[PDB]
Write a protein that binds this ligand. Structure first.
Ligand SMILES: CO[C@@H]1[C@@H](n2cc(-c3ccc(Cl)c(F)c3F)nn2)[C@@H](O)[C@@H](CO)O[C@@H]1Cc1cn(C2(CF)COC2)nn1
Ligand SMILES: [Cl-]
Length: 138
């Protein structure tokens, strides 16, 4: 186990068939979790479970370019529970990131940042106990 915030290097960026697995436990009274796939200061893919946005649970996904947040893609299907162990898997495909949580498909996010081989860091932050963060090629 690791203390957040944690930054997982992605040397030479990401490539299709790369499967990034984040294991942890959601804190009791969790408010937010964030994964930030970064290309330098740009956030190619921000994955942001929010546990109480206007008393609703929502997944917010977005890209940050030149320090500006773009168009949010939102999803009400919310597989996380306060206090429970989770597995987030981000599978890099040619045209999108595919996200599955606890072995159930959650969402796809089309590549806005095109230079996959420059998405060289993954930041992990928010209301989790981080167990591990790793990747393999499928
Ligand atoms: C509150 O800041 C949010 C941003 N955010 C979260 C964290 C964050 C830090 C620390 C921790 Cl531990 C975490 F879990 C975290 F999520 N940092 N920045 C990010 O979630 C963004 C996504 O779109 O939304 C917000 C910012 C935002 C959104 N917008 C619009 C365009 F998108 C929506 O109408 C205009 N303009 N600004
Ligand atoms: Cl944090």
């Amino acid at each position: 186990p690791l203390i957040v915030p944690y930054n997982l290097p992605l040397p030479g960026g990401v490539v299709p068939r790369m499967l990034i697995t984040i294991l942890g436990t959601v804190k009791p009274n969790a408010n937010r979790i964030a994964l930030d796939f970064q290309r330098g200061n740009d956030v190619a893919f921000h994955f942001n479970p929010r546990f109480n946005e206007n008393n609703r649970r929502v997944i917010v996904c977005n890209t940050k370019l030149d320090n500006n947040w773009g168009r949010e893609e939102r999803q009400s299907v919310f597989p996380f529970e306060s206090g429970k162990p989770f597995k987030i898997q981000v599978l890099v495909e040619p045209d999108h990131f595919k996200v599955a949580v606890n072995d159930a498909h959650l969402l796809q996010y089309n590549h806005r940042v095109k230079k996959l081989n420059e998405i060289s860091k993954l930041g992990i932050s928010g209301d989790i106990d981080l167990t591990s963060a790793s990747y393999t090629m499928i």
